[PDB]
Design a protein around this ligand. Structure first.
Ligand SMILES: NC(=O)C1=CN([C@@H]2O[C@H](COP(=O)(O)OP(=O)(O)OC[C@H]3O[C@@H](n4cnc5c(N)ncnc54)[C@H](OP(=O)(O)O)[C@@H]3O)[C@@H](O)[C@H]2O)C=CC1
Ligand SMILES: NC(=O)C1=CN([C@@H]2O[C@H](COP(=O)(O)OP(=O)(O)OC[C@H]3O[C@@H](n4cnc5c(N)ncnc54)[C@H](OP(=O)(O)O)[C@@H]3O)[C@@H](O)[C@H]2O)C=CC1
Ligand SMILES: O=C(O)CCC(=O)C(=O)O
Ligand SMILES: O=C(O)CCC(=O)C(=O)O
Ligand SMILES: [Ca+2]
Ligand SMILES: [Ca+2]
Lengths: 410, 410
């Protein structure tokens, strides 16, 4: 009978397939009925991006930068096949790469633990956080094929040939056809990455591990290991020793293994690509991709981009296309909204907003924890192949709706 | 009371730290006593590589190329810390990066399965086989630091400006200091990697998944996806449909997640860097890094390099250095030997050797399976912290020696 007035505007980026269905239903029954928010809509569906020539993604990202908070829905990243499917103009770049490259920062990811649910990696009991660097490397590289024999070279030409000097490093000499590419990153980005990773370790009282491959990419990865170590000793080694938490660099090999056999409970900082890949493993490993939150934070600490860790769940969308029933977990999507709404509230000092968010969350999880109403993904975790063990994609969302309404009378 | 003559010679590459110590005992107590082998030795310790200016590495690589079979102990790949520890000249490149780059091929790694021993990803019940592309990408890249503002271009100059034309892509425009890198790979190499993969899928009658990140590196990762598919239909899809196995390319993100929640029982052809990182996850997932074999197979199928998949085990070596007890798993190391002897045998039609290999493996595994003698990692796998559950590095090794004697009388 009353609505919470949200101060500043929230930027919303709509997506594709299964996740677009879930999204809408979420803001219809779970968000709009309770909030007086000014949503600045941006449709990032393939058809929208195509028609707009990906320009909209530029606009969306710059909207987020402006207003501070963004809630993004899963989106189809066009690969040859996709182009055929939607008869696209170009084979557009992942909008996630464009946004992330525009905003910068780290993408913090961690599973949503529902006690009632088992775990694929049983020994894991305490949440594992992934601090994926969002800025460069291969999500902003320059790949290209190489026709026939010739020389490959990476060339650098300074602006002021007085403080530095040119470089022409011979990369290879093809004797046949193949591929090549080059990527990059900056000291500025890595430093923010480090600052954001040390802060979260301190804020959550968890040990921090930076994983790299510095024994191979001696200079490249070495810059990561070194800046981290520099910043640490510079202004965290104090609060860390005082908190009982340690920072340590390890080789990615050792770390992913150390993790697979641990009880979870620590922060893993990784380069973009590793943050990307491993986050999925952690996700799937704690239960299902349906139970992992994701949020990009800028070094500022005043800009956010909330999203689910998974994709558009195409495989499930395909079933939905042919009148077949679906059991897609919407929990990450709900949290994508709640966590977005949370940062919105802290930024504007609107505790009414933050409270609602925790209620949204508390009700979403309890519908599983308490009432035992879960989708197929979580059902297979408990060990029940039986169809009568789970509910549909819409049935679940309705149960969350119902329990939310109850938990709002208190 | 008799020795097995080994027709052709075996190239042996000694290495560092705890693995060097294990290595020695293996050959003194398990290989030399039963074989008449012309072992073409090559000490690849850090010191032996430093004084030799890493040339020995080159020599060893080329020796394996010549005599067909090489067996390697784990080596230290120097980084800044190492240069200061052993007071080295240069920060030498990984001798594994150097060997693989010279032999080419695919590195097939899978877990060594010990029934009594549990698994960290219980749902896994059938061996997962990694097919790591051994040739290029970041394991033969070129990186450097960017001092200050300037351009960064990927310059390509073909030899015959008729069949192909130069390229000069603009990678980035630094507005500050950062890092830059560039890597490559050849279509020829990829064809080999693809062929090898498939053949293995058939021989072992298992599904073949190729993972990639083409949505991001459309040209680079795309090539892998394409050449793979081209080869499939070009000469395998026949035998596949016939056997009931299905090849298939998926996004890395997906494959790692599928894998984690699967029951296992498939082959994951991965790109070099991925093959590296995933194989550790997989090995640790099945029990411990110590229970996993790794062997390089050149495109020919007539050149091999057996090795353990793990490193030199510094943390343990450190304990040893100060007169403390050790519990390092030697199974990987021993199989590096056996798998190499076996490979030598299938090439010199020496069924006598192939018999020793299998009995060696047999006894190595039954020491754990039957007699219940194992190292601390396998004890904890079983869930027993109690000191009395495992035995020292040397202790375990002696047990394999003793049981080896027995099982040989038959
Ligand atoms: N950040 C973003 O916007 C991203 C977008 N994408 C895009 O999404 C599309 C599909 O990508 P894909 O490789 O399938 O990755 P997905 O995240 O869509 O993975 C789907 C697979 O994992 C399972 N899964 C994933 N999410 C859920 C969920 N919420 N509930 C239940 N199960 C789930 C599905 O279940 P099951 O095993 O039963 O089939 C299926 O196997 C592509 O266009 C891709 O580019 C991909 C990644 C990130
Ligand atoms: N192919 C090669 O020659 C390789 C060489 N290296 C080199 O090895 C050195 C050490 O690298 P590092 O990061 O420690 O990687 P390691 O392979 O040495 O990993 C050691 C870690 O994993 C565990 N572990 C690994 N192997 C075993 C084993 N056989 N038995 C029991 N436990 C094991 C150890 O257990 P615990 O948790 O108790 O410490 C330790 O945590 C470095 O110089 C690295 O460059 C690295 C990779 C490959
Ligand atoms: O941009 C994309 O295609 C999705 C990348 C991805 O897997 C993720 O952000 O989780
Ligand atoms: O070369 C190195 O440092 C080790 C690389 C590695 O992890 C492997 O060969 O499995
Ligand atoms: Ca991902
Ligand atoms: Ca490895």
């Amino acid at each position: 009978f009353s609505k919470i007035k949200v101060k500043q505007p929230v930027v919303e980026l709509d997506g594709d397939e299964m996740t677009r269905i879930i999204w809408d239903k979420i803001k219809k029954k779970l968000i709009l009925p309770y909030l007086d928010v000014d949503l600045k809509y941006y449709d990032l569906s393939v058809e929208s991006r195509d028609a707009t020539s990906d320009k909209i993604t530029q606009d969306a990202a710059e909207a987020i930068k402006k207003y501070g908070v963004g809630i993004k829905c899963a989106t189809i990243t066009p690969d040859e096949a996709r182009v055929k499917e939607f008869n696209l103009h170009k084979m557009w770049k992942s909008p996630n790469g464009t946004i992330r490259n525009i905003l910068g920062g780290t993408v913090f990811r961690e599973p949503i633990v529902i006690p009632r649910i088992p775990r694929l990696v049983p020994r894991w009991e305490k949440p594992i956080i992934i601090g994926r660097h969002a800025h460069g490397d291969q999500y902003k590289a320059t790949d290209t094929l190489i026709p026939g024999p010739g020389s490959l070279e990476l060339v650098y030409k300074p602006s002021d040939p007085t403080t530095a000097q040119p470089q022409t490093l011979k990369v290879y000499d093809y004797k046949g056809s193949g591929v090549a590419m080059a990527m990059y990153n900056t000291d500025e980005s890595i430093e923010g990455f480090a600052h954001s990773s040390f802060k979260l370790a301190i804020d959550k009282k968890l040990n921090l591990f930076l994983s790299t491959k510095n024994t191979i990419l001696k200079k490249y990865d070495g810059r990561f290991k070194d800046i981290f170590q520099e910043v640490y000793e510079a202004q965290y080694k104090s609060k860390f020793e005082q908190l009982g938490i340690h920072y340590e660099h390890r080789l990615i090999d050792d770390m992913v293994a150390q993790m697979i056999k641990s009880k979870g409970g620590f922060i893993m900082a990784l380069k973009n690509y590793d943050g990307d890949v491993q986050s999925d493993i952690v996700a799937q490993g704690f239960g299902s991709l349906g139970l992992m939150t994701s949020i990009l934070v800028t070094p500022d600490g005043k800009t956010f981009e909330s999203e689910a860790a998974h994709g558009t769940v195409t495989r499930h969308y395909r079933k939905y296309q042919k009148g077949e029933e679906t059991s897609t977990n919407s929990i990450a999507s709900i949290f994508a909204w709640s966590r977005g709404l949370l940062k919105r509230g802290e930024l504007d000092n609107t505790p009414a907003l933050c409270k609602f968010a925790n209620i949204l969350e508390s009700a979403t999880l309890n519908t599983v924890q308490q009432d035992g109403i879960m989708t197929k993904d979580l059902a297979l975790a408990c060990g029940n192949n039986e169809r009568s063990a789970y509910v549909t994609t819409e049935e679940f969302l309705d149960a969350v709706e119902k329990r939310l309404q109850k938990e709002i009378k208190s």
